[PDB]
Structure 1
Amino acid sequence: SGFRKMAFPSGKVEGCMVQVTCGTTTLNGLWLDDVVYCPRHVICTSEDMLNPNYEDLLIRKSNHNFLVQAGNVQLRVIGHSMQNCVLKLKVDTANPKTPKYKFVRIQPGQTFSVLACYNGSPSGVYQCAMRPNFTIKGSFLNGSCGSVGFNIDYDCVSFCYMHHMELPTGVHAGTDLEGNFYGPFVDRQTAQAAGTDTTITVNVLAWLYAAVINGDRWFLNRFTTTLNDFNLVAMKYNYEPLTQDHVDILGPLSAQTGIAVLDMCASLKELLQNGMNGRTILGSALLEDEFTPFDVVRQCSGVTFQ
């Protein structure tokens, strides 16, 4: 029993991290096969970041301007191109530790593990969720740019996030591995606004099911509710509206606990209106939305990977 914010094992990703240097700037890159992926603003100086013309800047760079180190093994850049907001440095040596991998663009509310890196070397691993406003609430210092987010599906590493910037508000923004930002952000040092952040309701419900699995049942209500009446309460409290697809996803958790999804929603409705009154659920005094229904099934059933 028990429940923890659990990350994926990072071994397969550690052997793909390299440091990329272009002039004075050094950040992390992802070395898969004979291509190194990294944020394109590595070609910028501190002055260029206020209003960078990436095409013009990249023209003044040639293959020998980029320095890729994989520990004490230096790679030679043989070609370079710009795909959206990432640079693709084609190198001579293919990574011998390349795992079976895939590039994926996740949807808001999904979770993934982050391997925070500095100078190409891993520092730590943690789990987080893509917020509905396409930011993440991470833990990043200067030089962490190019650190990647990922999931593991059996033997396959699914890369879904590359870190690019910290907003003036202290939250974090990045791209998929094809260089398309999550959200409306641009890789430029200017004031940028993230939308209103909401709570991922389907995740909160999954977490309440995890609490029931672990013996925390005090919030279980003697009432029920309707999908429309719940959504009317949820939207007052800045919660994501619940759809039928969400009910379908929670089905397995309903069957294991014998508690119908709508009855769980009624318990959530009371928690929203009356608070938690100094009590706790699974050790927390707040409603938690960083666990997807699949995360809960994974942890409470013991799924492993290669």
Structure 2
Amino acid sequence: SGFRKMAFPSGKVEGCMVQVTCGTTTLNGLWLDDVVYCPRHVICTSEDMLNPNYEDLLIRKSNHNFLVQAGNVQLRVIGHSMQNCVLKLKVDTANPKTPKYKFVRIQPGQTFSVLACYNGSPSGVYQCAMRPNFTIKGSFLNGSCGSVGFNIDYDCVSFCYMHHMELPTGVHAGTDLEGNFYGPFVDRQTAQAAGTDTTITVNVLAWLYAAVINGDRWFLNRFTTTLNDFNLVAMKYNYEPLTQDHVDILGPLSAQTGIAVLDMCASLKELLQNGMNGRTILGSALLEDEFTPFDVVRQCSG
């Protein structure tokens, strides 16, 4: 029993965190095998960030300009290449702590753990979700760039996010590990803003099923809804449209609890209308949207 926002154990990722310095700029790098991955803006100064020509800035650098520090050991850079917004620094030592890993690009609504790092040293771990507007509501200060987001599937680390910037609303933007930004963001200090964010409907429903599994049914009702009527109501509260894929994905939780997905949708519609009336659901007075159907099944069952 109990339902917590649970991060993956960070050990496999901690053994990959390194410090990358280029000139006056210091950030974090991810050392996997003989390559250190880091944001390409490590080659920029603050002035360069308005309209940086990364190809032009990078061609002026040599291997020895990049100082890579793994613990108290300086790694030697023997090559460098840029792939989208990520710099790949070839080093002369393969990381003996390299876990079984893969690079995965996630979709909005997906969750992941973030190992926040400063100067190549892990400081904390928390759970995040890729917002529908492609930002993450992280906890990141200056020096956190290069910190990564991941999931662990059996013994395999799936790296899905690398931190690049904080937008003016305090939310965060980054790339997958191939350097492709999530959303319409660029690694420039040009005027950029997160789009209007919305609630991840499929995740709220997953969390309502988690509440039912843990013994809370106060919010259920005798009603059902069509998917279209649910979406018409949902959109009015800035909730993401629920697709047939989402309904299919919620099938297992629907079967375990005996509550049809559209029956849970009617409950959600009523919660949006009435609020909680001084009550809580899994210790929360707000509808929680950073647990996926997969996270609920993992935490409530195994």
Deviation at 1:215, TM superposition (A): 1.3
Deviation at 1:51, TM superposition (A): 1.9
Indicate the SS of the match to 2:49.
helix
Deviation at 1:160, TM superposition (A): 0.3
Contact 2:115 2:125 in 1 (8 A): yes
**Separation in 2 of the partners of 1:246 and 1:181?**
25
Contact 1:27 1:146 in 2 (8 A): yes
Deviation at 1:169, TM superposition (A): 1.5
**Separation in 2 of the partners of 1:20 and 1:225?**
53
Deviations 1:191-228 (A, max 9, x none): 10221211111100000001011111100101121111
**Separation in 2 of the partners of 1:136 and 1:296?**
20
Deviation at 1:251, TM superposition (A): 1.0
Deviation at 1:84, TM superposition (A): 0.8
Deviation at 1:58, TM superposition (A): 1.0
Deviations 1:241-273 (A, max 9, x none): 111111111111111111111111111111111
Q: Give TM-score, length-normalised by structure 1.
A: 0.97
Deviations 1:26-64 (A, max 9, x none): 100000000000001111112211221111111211011
Q: Give TM-score, length-normalised by structure 2.
A: 0.98
| More deviation, 236-245/11-20 | 236-245
**Separation in 2 of the partners of 1:82 and 1:11?**
28
**Separation in 2 of the partners of 1:224 and 1:64?**
65
**Separation in 2 of the partners of 1:131 and 1:90?**
33
Alignment length (residue pairs): 302
Contact 2:115 2:122 in 1 (8 A): yes
Contact 1:27 1:120 in 2 (8 A): yes
Q: Which runs of 5+ in 2 are unaligned?
A: none
Indicate the SS of the match to 1:49.
coil
Deviation at 1:278, TM superposition (A): 2.0
Deviation at 1:190, TM superposition (A): 1.9
| More deviation, 209-218/273-282 | 273-282
Contact 1:81 1:88 in 2 (8 A): yes
**Separation in 1 of the partners of 2:187 and 2:259?**
46
Other-structure match for 1:95:
95
Contact 1:111 1:291 in 2 (8 A): yes
**Separation in 1 of the partners of 2:206 and 2:49?**
42
Indicate the SS of the match to 1:36.
strand
Deviation at 1:168, TM superposition (A): 1.4
Other-structure match for 2:35:
35
**Separation in 2 of the partners of 1:295 and 1:88?**
32
**Separation in 2 of the partners of 1:279 and 1:100?**
44
Moved over 3 A (4+): none
**Separation in 1 of the partners of 2:81 and 2:264?**
51
| More deviation, 243-252/92-101 | 243-252
Contact 1:168 1:191 in 2 (8 A): no
**Separation in 2 of the partners of 1:234 and 1:17?**
41
**Separation in 2 of the partners of 1:224 and 1:283?**
26
**Separation in 1 of the partners of 2:263 and 2:165?**
42
Deviation at 1:232, TM superposition (A): 1.0
Contact 2:63 2:80 in 1 (8 A): yes
**Separation in 1 of the partners of 2:34 and 2:84?**
19
Q: Answer yes or no: is 1:218 the counterpart of 2:243.
A: no
Contact 2:168 2:193 in 1 (8 A): no
Indicate the SS of the match to 1:57.
helix
**Separation in 2 of the partners of 1:167 and 1:226?**
38
Deviation at 1:293, TM superposition (A): 0.3
**Separation in 1 of the partners of 2:282 and 2:82?**
46
| More deviation, 247-256/120-129 | 247-256
**Separation in 2 of the partners of 1:252 and 1:189?**
44
| More deviation, 14-23/237-246 | 237-246
| More deviation, 127-136/241-250 | 241-250
1:1-306 to structure 2, matched below 5 A, reads 1-302=1-302
| More deviation, 157-166/247-256 | 247-256
Contact 1:209 1:253 in 2 (8 A): yes
RMSD: 0.8
**Separation in 2 of the partners of 1:238 and 1:159?**
30
Contact 1:17 1:28 in 2 (8 A): yes
Contact 1:146 1:163 in 2 (8 A): yes
